[PDB]
Amino acid sequence: LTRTQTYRATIESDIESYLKKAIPIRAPESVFEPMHHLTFAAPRTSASALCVAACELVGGDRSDAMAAAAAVHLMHVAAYTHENLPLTDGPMSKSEIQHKFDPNIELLTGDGIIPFGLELMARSMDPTRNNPDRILRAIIELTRVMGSEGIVEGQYHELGLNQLNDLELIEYVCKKKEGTLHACGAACGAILGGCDEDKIEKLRRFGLYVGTVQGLLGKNRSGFEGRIKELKELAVKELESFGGEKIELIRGVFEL
Amino acid sequence: LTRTQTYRATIESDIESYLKKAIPIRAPESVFEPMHHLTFAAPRTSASALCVAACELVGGDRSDAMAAAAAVHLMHVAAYTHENLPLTDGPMSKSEIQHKFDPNIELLTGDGIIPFGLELMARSMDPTRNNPDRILRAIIELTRVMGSEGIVEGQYHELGLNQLNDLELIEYVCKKKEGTLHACGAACGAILGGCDEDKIEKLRRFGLYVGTVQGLLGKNRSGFEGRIKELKELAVKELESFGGEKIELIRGVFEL
């Protein structure tokens, strides 16, 4: 592996180890079995690593952002689970997955995973009395990503979908789902990192741009090459205000 | 109406109006339409009123509990929405309701409502009081009600309940759903009104007993009347060592 890959993977290993301490497979039974299973079977999102990297970029330790990064992963897991949830007329996502558990169980496990991430984030503060306004602000960010400003807005418009036709509607969905998830990750990193009000906004915009790109790639319909270079350039702009070699690894992680 | 009824109705009206400020009908536009519809169509839970009442009881102002009380209502509506949600096998709840919106929409709207309440709660921080510690502690309580310690655990076990069933299993379901909901409301009430560790747990237990009664009552299928009287006196016991006018009103609301 390259320095960049090693860096992403180590972050992702630290996140997974952090979650494993919080969610025992302790089951068959209690929500814990489907909660443990869905969390670690789900595809990862680069939004979780951006959270940690954003925090380090501004001088935080990674233990400062571990709870946030894990919460980001969990919001994503909750969204992913509910998107692939078989309803009356099947799931919202047309690309089918394997299900080890019944629909009813996936529904409630998704419901339990949403606040669990916010509970971990809420319960991280306090050991020596750390950042109550900060952790509260981080919580605001995560609540924003899951709801009407973020993922659920995206999923709402994802319903009226068409075959690679409405490109602006597709982009909008990517911005609201993968976009908002990265924005939140980056903004949490920065908040927990102890950051300028101005520098939070910038990393937030950064996350939005790379998250939208990550979304668009996940469509892979190519009608987007020009928009992708457009957004990548905006991502770089935001980065210019920071520095210190973590910049290079972050640029690396996001193919910039 | 009696003083007790008026007192409860005023609270419920103050909660509704506080929520009406936060969720626009927005007409068709966005998840806000179903979010608004489902919030104000859903049956109320007394856990919401207990929050305000618990707060006032310990010298709190009601505007201090208003966000919490609304968040409690919202947790209850997300739960209600999801358990009546038509799946492949139909809804988890055997008691059918009317559905103005499609299953897929109800699934998104439920997911948006969960963090929204926590966001309302989080955005209520009072830097001129000491709230970041307090409000953060309130968020812990609400995250608890929704998850593995609460409603989801209850719903998980409720799966596979019929006639002539496990009575201890039924009470357990009531404890985890209605019980935890009231326990959280009461405990948030206490936290936000500003009392100590000892008195918070007393109100949380109070909430648990009365919530468990509300759940058992909301079934009335056979022989619970014995256990219901046992739980009511447990609730009164908790109320000893609290004082004031509000004690009679709370005893009234919950018929102790």
Side-chain angles (χ1 to χ4, degrees), chain A residues 1-28 30-256, chain B residues 1-28 30-256:
Chain A
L1 303 186
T2 66
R3 181 57 141 88
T4 301
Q5 292 171 335
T6 290
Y7 180 71
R8 190 190 163 152
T10 310
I11 293 180
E12 281 175 3
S13 170
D14 288 325
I15 291 166
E16 197 178 54
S17 283
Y18 179 83
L19 282 159
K20 266 159 148 63
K21 289 162 172 215
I23 311 163
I25 184 68
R26 132 205 272 113
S30 232
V31 212
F32 278 109
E33 178 190 20
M35 186 173 330
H36 187 97
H37 184 256
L38 300 186
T39 304
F40 309 96
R44 74 227 191 306
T45 166
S46 57
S48 303
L50 180 54
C51 185
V52 176
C55 185
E56 288 181 341
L57 178 58
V58 298
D61 180 63
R62 68 173 50 188
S63 68
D64 283 337
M66 215 40 60
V72 167
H73 172 73
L74 290 160
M75 294 307 101
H76 158 79
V77 166
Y80 183 81
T81 308
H82 280 187
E83 269 157 41
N84 288 275
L85 179 62
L87 294 172
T88 255
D89 56 347
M92 281 175 158
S93 182
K94 273 204 80 212
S95 65
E96 282 159 42
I97 69 173
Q98 299 297 338
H99 305 271
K100 181 179 179 169
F101 293 98
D102 284 81
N104 52 16
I105 301 302
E106 289 175 347
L107 170 68
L108 66 85
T109 305
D111 287 359
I113 277 158
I114 294 162
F116 190 90
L118 306 163
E119 186 186 343
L120 300 184
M121 180 79 274
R123 283 197 197 268
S124 66
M125 115 95 186
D126 182 52
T128 185
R129 309 328 295 249
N130 296 136
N131 343 295
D133 181 65
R134 267 180 206 183
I135 266 144
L136 216 42
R137 192 169 170 183
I139 275 153
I140 290 150
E141 280 303 308
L142 292 136
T143 60
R144 194 179 71 71
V145 75
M146 194 59 259
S148 326
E149 297 196 37
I151 287 165
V152 162
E153 233 302 64
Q155 301 173 338
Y156 181 88
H157 300 285
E158 201 175 359
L159 288 178
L161 208 56
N162 326 103
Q163 325 133 44
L164 141 80
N165 302 289
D166 200 349
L167 262 54
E168 285 95 358
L169 164 64
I170 290 165
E171 187 173 353
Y172 182 66
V173 164
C174 288
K175 186 179 141 180
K176 254 51 197 79
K177 299 175 62 192
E178 293 86 348
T180 307
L181 211 39
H182 286 69
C184 169
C188 281
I191 285 157
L192 297 158
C195 222
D196 271 60
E197 286 277 35
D198 304 9
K199 288 189 286 221
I200 302 168
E201 293 157 28
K202 284 196 164 276
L203 275 151
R204 197 190 271 102
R205 291 199 295 286
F206 178 81
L208 195 61
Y209 305 140
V210 293
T212 303
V213 166
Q214 218 75 327
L216 285 171
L217 264 54
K219 252 65 189 184
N220 216 251
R221 253 78 226 290
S222 275
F224 295 112
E225 264 216 311
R227 217 338 199 205
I228 279 144
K229 217 212 99 58
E230 198 168 328
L231 286 151
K232 286 197 169 194
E233 289 192 300
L234 291 173
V236 106
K237 324 275 202 64
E238 300 300 347
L239 284 192
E240 302 206 326
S241 300
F242 308 88
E245 212 185 297
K246 288 282 179 289
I247 267 212
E248 259 51 52
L249 299 171
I250 294 159
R251 276 168 189 168
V253 166
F254 291 94
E255 221 100 47
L256 308 167
Chain B
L1 262 48
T2 74
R3 173 140 100 86
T4 296
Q5 297 176 318
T6 284
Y7 176 77
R8 184 187 172 165
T10 296
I11 289 165
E12 289 180 351
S13 154
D14 285 343
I15 288 161
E16 201 177 52
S17 271
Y18 178 85
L19 277 166
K20 270 191 154 50
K21 303 191 168 186
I23 317 148
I25 323 181
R26 182 156 163 144
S30 276
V31 275
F32 278 116
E33 175 196 5
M35 191 179 313
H36 186 95
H37 181 256
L38 300 176
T39 299
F40 305 101
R44 338 256 256 277
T45 165
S46 44
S48 284
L50 179 56
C51 193
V52 180
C55 188
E56 312 195 309
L57 179 70
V58 294
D61 204 84
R62 73 163 50 184
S63 72
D64 297 321
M66 210 47 38
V72 168
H73 175 80
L74 294 166
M75 293 312 97
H76 156 79
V77 355
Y80 180 88
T81 307
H82 283 170
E83 54 197 59
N84 287 270
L85 177 67
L87 293 172
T88 261
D89 180 275
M92 292 194 307
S93 182
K94 317 296 171 76
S95 293
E96 61 209 341
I97 63 173
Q98 291 311 315
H99 291 287
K100 189 198 180 156
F101 295 103
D102 284 288
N104 54 8
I105 300 291
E106 301 191 335
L107 166 71
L108 306 185
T109 304
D111 291 353
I113 280 155
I114 294 173
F116 194 92
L118 306 164
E119 185 185 354
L120 293 184
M121 184 68 224
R123 284 185 192 279
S124 80
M125 202 274 287
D126 202 47
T128 193
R129 190 169 160 156
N130 86 281
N131 294 33
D133 159 66
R134 261 177 203 183
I135 273 160
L136 209 38
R137 232 185 314 150
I139 269 112
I140 285 138
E141 282 305 307
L142 286 157
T143 61
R144 264 201 15 174
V145 80
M146 195 62 254
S148 339
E149 308 199 34
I151 294 167
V152 158
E153 185 60 6
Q155 300 173 336
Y156 182 77
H157 291 287
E158 186 161 32
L159 296 167
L161 261 74
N162 309 124
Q163 189 55 22
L164 297 168
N165 259 58
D166 199 327
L167 282 98
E168 324 288 338
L169 169 60
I170 295 165
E171 177 179 3
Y172 181 66
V173 164
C174 292
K175 210 180 98 184
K176 255 53 188 61
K177 302 177 69 194
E178 291 83 354
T180 308
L181 204 65
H182 286 75
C184 169
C188 282
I191 291 167
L192 298 163
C195 44
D196 44 358
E197 298 282 11
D198 301 348
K199 288 181 173 198
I200 292 161
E201 188 51 77
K202 280 190 164 289
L203 276 151
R204 200 196 275 99
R205 286 191 303 265
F206 175 87
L208 189 59
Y209 302 138
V210 69
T212 303
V213 168
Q214 293 299 106
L216 292 161
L217 255 29
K219 294 180 191 283
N220 272 147
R221 200 119 261 287
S222 260
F224 278 125
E225 196 35 58
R227 181 56 173 149
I228 286 151
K229 87 164 281 175
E230 189 178 334
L231 287 153
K232 285 195 171 196
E233 43 198 38
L234 280 174
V236 184
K237 215 83 194 78
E238 294 303 340
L239 286 188
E240 315 256 328
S241 81
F242 294 98
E245 32 168 30
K246 301 290 183 279
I247 269 208
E248 186 220 49
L249 298 155
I250 293 165
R251 275 200 186 118
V253 161
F254 293 106
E255 312 188 287
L256 315 166

